[PDB]
Design a protein around this ligand. Structure first.
Ligand SMILES: [Cl-]
Ligand SMILES: [Cl-]
Length: 129
């Protein structure tokens, strides 16, 4: 599914991401925009053989099992394909574990390079939330 900006903002809010570990909703929407262009089916392969999955491009080296990343830790205890669903619950639940692990949203390279330190509230402007 390819979300609209406000649709995704609203879904993320319902799933408890607004201000989760101090990260306002716009951070999450901005991260999803640049990680996946709001496409839950986005995948990207990395040089190390791992693959990033879904709207928040969660990586198979640490977080989900895709059966082809040797040494994966599967810390979210899910198959990576679960992260591609039109239902974002699995991605959100896993993201909450990621953002809690010490490095906050710096785990998302696009967030660090394209969202952090910008006016992220712009990503939810105009939305009925
Ligand atoms: Cl915000
Ligand atoms: Cl980037």
């Amino acid at each position: 599914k390819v979300f609209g900006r406000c649709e995704l903002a609203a879904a993320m809010k319902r799933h408890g991401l607004d201000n989760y570990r101090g990260y306002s909703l716009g951070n999450w929407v901005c991260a999803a925009k640049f990680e996946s262009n709001f496409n839950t089916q986005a995948t990207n392969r990395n040089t190390d053989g791992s693959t990033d999955y879904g709207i928040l491009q969660i990586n198979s080296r640490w977080w989900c099992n895709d059966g082809r990343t040797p040494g994966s830790r599967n810390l979210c205890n899910i198959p990576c394909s679960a992260l591609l669903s039109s239902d974002i619950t699995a991605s959100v639940n896993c993201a909450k574990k990621i953002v809690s692990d010490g490095n906050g949203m710096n785990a998302w390279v696009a967030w660090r390079n394209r969202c952090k330190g910008t006016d992220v509230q712009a990503w939810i402007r105009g939305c009925r939330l």
